[PDB]
Amino acid sequence: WWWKYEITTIHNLFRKLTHRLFRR
């Protein structure tokens, strides 16, 4: 992902959901 620059914005708060996504 090279356009991560547009994701880092929410990626700072989405990381909390990933713990439930990737895991479930």
Return the closest-CA partner of residue 15 out of 23, 5, 1. Answer: 23
For residues 22 and 16, the answer to whether their CB atoms sit within 8 Å is: no
Token pair in block for residue 21: 């996504």
Concatenate the DSSP letters of all residues of 1-24 into one string.
--GGGGTHHHHHHHHHHHHHHTT-
Return the closest-CA partner of residue 7 out of 24, 15, 23, 16. Answer: 15
For residues 4 and 11, the answer to whether their CB atoms sit within 8 Å is: yes
